[PDB]
C-alpha cells in the first residue's frame, strides 16, 4: 500500500499534546481539500514573518503561547474574509 500513503500525505496532519495523561501522544486527522492550498498565500505568509518576529524578541511566561493561539484565531478571520472577496 505505497500508493495510498503518497496520495494521502498531502492530507495527513499530525499533532503532539500533553495533558490528562502526564505523557505525550500523537493524533492524526485529515485536514481539508481547499484550506491547505489556500493557506499558501502571499497575503498571510508575510504576516507570520511578522508574527514569528514578535514572539522571539519579547519573551516571558506562557503568555508567549497565549498570543500564539490569539494569532491563530485572528489568522482564520483574515482567511475567512479572504474567501468572501475572491470571485
Amino acid at each position: 500500500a505505497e500508493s495510498i500513503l503518497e496520495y494521502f500525505r498531502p492530507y495527513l496532519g499530525r499533532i503532539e499534546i500533553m495533558g490528562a495523561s502526564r505523557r505525550i501522544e500523537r493524533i492524526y486527522f485529515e485536514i481539508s481539500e481547499t484550506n491547505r492550498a489556500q493557506w499558501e498565500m502571499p497575503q498571510v505568509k508575510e504576516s507570520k514573518r511578522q508574527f514569528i518576529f514578535d514572539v522571539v524578541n519579547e519573551g516571558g511566561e506562557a503568555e508567549k503561547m497565549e498570543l500564539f493561539v490569539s494569532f491563530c484565531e485572528d489568522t482564520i478571520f483574515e482567511m475567512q474574509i479572504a474567501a468572501q472577496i475572491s470571485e
Binding site: R14, I24, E25, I31, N35, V55, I76, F77
Partner: protein
C-alpha cells in the same frame, strides 16, 4: 438596487490587487518628480513668476496637470481598498480583546475602568446593542451575567451592559422565533449610529490609516503651482526594510539625546557670557573702515553667533576671531580657546555621534537573533537542536512530522466543521480545555521521544 451587486463586485476587483495598485505610486512619483528638475525661475511671465523651462520634447504639456490628478486617482482608490480589505480585522482585534477581557476580568464592573487612553473611549460600546457585530461570539452578555450578575445587583449589571428589557426578555426568546423579511435600503437609518461613532474613533486612532490618508492631502494640495509632489517620495521610499532600520534608529534612542543636547546649549552659554563680559573687544568682524557689527553687544546676539559658527566651525572658535597676538591678555585667550576645543568639538559632538551609531549596534543584532532561534529552538517544546543532531536530519525532520507550528491552525479549523457528537475521546478533550483558555496541552519540553527514550529508540 441592481447596481448595488455590481458596485460591490466592482470593489472586489479593487481589493483583489491592492499592493499592486500601491506600487504604481512609486514609479509614478519618480517621473512627476524627475522632470521637475528642469525648472527655471525668471523675472518675466511666460513680483516674479516661477517660470518653467521645458526641453525640445512635446511632453511636459499641461498634461502634467492630468499627470497630477493621475497620481491622486491611483491613490484615491487605495482609500476604498484599504477601507474594504484592511479594516474588517481592526474591529475584530479590538472586539476579541474586550470580549476575552469580560470573560475573565470585570475591570468595567468590579473595581474601576483604567490614564485611560484608548480605554476610556471603550465605554461607549457597552450600551451599543451591536457590540458582537464582528466577533465570533454573539452571546457575551449572557456569560458575564452568569458570573457577576448574581453576586452584584443583577438589575445593575443587566442595565450597564445593555440588555434593553432583556431582564424579562431573557426567557422570552425560548418558545419560537419568526423570520422577518429584509428591509434593506428602507430602514437603514434604524441602526446603532452611536456605535458608528465608536467605529470611527478607532479608525482615526489607527497608525496605518492616518499615514496613507496623510499621503492623500499633499496629492490634493499638490495641484497648486508648487513642488509639493516631492514630499510623496520621502514617506514611501522608507518602505524598504533595511532603510526603515536607519530612520528608526534616531527614534529608538530619542529619550536619551534630548537630555544630552540640552547640556550642549548650556555649556556654550557659560562660554558665551564670559567672553561678552571680558573678551568683547576682540570679535570685531571688521567691515570696511567701521565696526558697528559687534557680535558681543547684545545678550542674545552673541549667543546666536557661537552656535551659528563655533559648533559648525570644525576647529574651534579661534577660526573666525581676530588675532590674539596682542600684548594684553595674550595668555588668557589660549586658555579660553583651547578649553573650548576640548569641551565641545572633541567630546560632546563625538558623544552625540556615538549614540546614533550605537543604535545600529542593537538593531542589527536583533536581525540576527531571529535567525539563531530557528537553527536551535523549535519554539514549540523546550528543546534545542542538540538532541536532534545526534541522528542525521533530526532537526530537519522535526519541522515536518513533529510540531511544524503550521498544522495547528489546520487542526483547529477541523474542529469547527465537526459536530459535538462526532468528537473522539481526545478531540473533545482539547475542545473543552480550549474554551477555558488554558494552554497546558502544548508539549513544552518533550516531543514523543524523551518519554520514549529507554523504552524504544
Amino acid at each position: 438596487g441592481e447596481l448595488e451587486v455590481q458596485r460591490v463586485k466592482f470593489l472586489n476587483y479593487l481589493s483583489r490587487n491592492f499592493y499592486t495598485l500601491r506600487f504604481l505610486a512609486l514609479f509614478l512619483a519618480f517621473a512627476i518628480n524627475f522632470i521637475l528638475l528642469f525648472y527655471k525661475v525668471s523675472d518675466s511671465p511666460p513680483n516674479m513668476v516661477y517660470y518653467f523651462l521645458e526641453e525640445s520634447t512635446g511632453y511636459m504639456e499641461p498634461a502634467l496637470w492630468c499627470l497630477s490628478l493621475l497620481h491622486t486617482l491611483v491613490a484615491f482608490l487605495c482609500i476604498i481598498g484599504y477601507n474594504c480589505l484592511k479594516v474588517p480585522l481592526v474591529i475584530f482585534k479590538r472586539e476579541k480583546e474586550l470580549a476575552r477581557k469580560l470573560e475573565f476580568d470585570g475591570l468595567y464592573i468590579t473595581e474601576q475602568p483604567g490614564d485611560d487612553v484608548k480605554g476610556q473611549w471603550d465605554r461607549l460600546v457597552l450600551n451599543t446593542p451591536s457590540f458582537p457585530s464582528n466577533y465570533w461570539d454573539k452571546f457575551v452578555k449572557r456569560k458575564v451575567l452568569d458570573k457577576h450578575g448574581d453576586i452584584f445587583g443583577r438589575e445593575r449589571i443587566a442595565e450597564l451592559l445593555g440588555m434593553d428589557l432583556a431582564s424579562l426578555e431573557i426567557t422570552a426568546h425560548n418558545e419560537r422565533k419568526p423570520d422577518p423579511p429584509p428591509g434593506l435600503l428602507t430602514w437603514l437609518m434604524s441602526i446603532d449610529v452611536k456605535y458608528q461613532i465608536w467605529k470611527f474613533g478607532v479608525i482615526f486612532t489607527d497608525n496605518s490609516f492616518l499615514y496613507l490618508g496623510w499621503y492623500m492631502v499633499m496629492s490634493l494640495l499638490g495641484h497648486y503651482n508648487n513642488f509639493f509632489f516631492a514630499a510623496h517620495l520621502l514617506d514611501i521610499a522608507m518602505g524598504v526594510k533595511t532603510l526603515r532600520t536607519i530612520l528608526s534608529s534616531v527614534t529608538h534612542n530619542g529619550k536619551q539625546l534630548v537630555m544630552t543636547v540640552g547640556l550642549l546649549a548650556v555649556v556654550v552659554y557659560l562660554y558665551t557670557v564670559v567672553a561678552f563680559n571680558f573678551f568683547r573687544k576682540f570679535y570685531n568682524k571688521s567691515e570696511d573702515e567701521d565696526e558697528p557689527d559687534m557680535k558681543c553687544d547684545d545678550m542674545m546676539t552673541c549667543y546666536l553667533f557661537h552656535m551659528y559658527v563655533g559648533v559648525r566651525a570644525g576647529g574651534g572658535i579661534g577660526d573666525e576671531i581676530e588675532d590674539p597676538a596682542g600684548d594684553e591678555y595674550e595668555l588668557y585667550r589660549v586658555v579660553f580657546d583651547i578649553t573650548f576645543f576640548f569641551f565641545v568639538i572633541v567630546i560632546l559632538l563625538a558623544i552625540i555621534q556615538g549614540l546614533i551609531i550605537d543604535a545600529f549596534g542593537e538593531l542589527r543584532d536583533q536581525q540576527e537573533q531571529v535567525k539563531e532561534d530557528m537553527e536551535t529552538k523549535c519554539f514549540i517544546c523546550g528543546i534545542g537542536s542538540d538532541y536532534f543532531d545526534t541522528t542525521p536530519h533530526g532537526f530537519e525532520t522535526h519541522t515536518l512530522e513533529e510540531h511544524n507550528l503550521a498544522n495547528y491552525m489546520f487542526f483547529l479549523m477541523y474542529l469547527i466543521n465537526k459536530d459535538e457528537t462526532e468528537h473522539t475521546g481526545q478531540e473533545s478533550y482539547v475542545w473543552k480545555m480550549y474554551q477555558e483558555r488554558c494552554w497546558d496541552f502544548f508539549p513544552a519540553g518533550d516531543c514523543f521521544r524523551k518519554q520514549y527514550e529507554d523504552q524504544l529508540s
